[PDB]
């Protein structure tokens, strides 16, 4: 199984930063 | 109104890294 | 004891800016 | 591109930012 977690964020800039990092980790992780 | 953005994250370890970063970013008034 | 400060090297201005925002936030918040 | 520096206080803080930087070097998202 996999688990999807929800992280709630205030402030567009905060959200945009975290989205870029999430996207990067999706692509850099071995799986 | 205040917009709360949702960041969907696969996996506990990935979530915990991003949550730590969010913990910091939410304390920062100017990002 | 003492404190260690590490030089993080980042390629590219836009990548530098995102990591700078994070580091600046961490310096204030001290969450790590 | 140029390489820029950021001074990072403390090993654990350096390690989290290094993890992100290394990820970005692999993914090229930013």
Gross morphology of chain A is: flat
Q: Strand tally of chain A, please? A: 1
Alpha carbon gap, first and last residue of chain A: 13 Å
What number of structural domains do the residues of chain A give?
1
How many helices of chain A?
Answer: 1
Rg from alpha-carbon coordinates of chain A: 11 Å
Measured as a percent range, the helix fraction of chain A is 40-55%
Oligomer state equals homotetramer
Largest contact between protein chains?
C-D, 22 and 22 residues
Structural class of chain A: alpha+beta
**Strand percentage of chain A, roughly?**
15-25%
Largest sheet of chain A: none
Task: State the order of secondary-structure elements of chain A, H for helix, E for strand.
Answer: EH
Tell me what you see in this structure.
Chain C: Zn(2+) 1 binds at residues 14, 30. Chain C: It is found in: Cytoplasm; Nucleus. Chain C: Residues 3-32 form the p53 tetramerisation domain. Chain C: This is Cellular tumor antigen p53. The structure is a homotetramer. The first copy, chain A, is 55% helix and 23% strand. Chain A has 31 residues and is of the alpha+beta class. Chain A has one domain. Chain A starts with a strand and ends with a helix. Chains in contact: A-B, A-C, A-D, B-C, C-D. At the C-D interface, strand 1 and helix 1 of C face strand 1 and helix 1 of D.
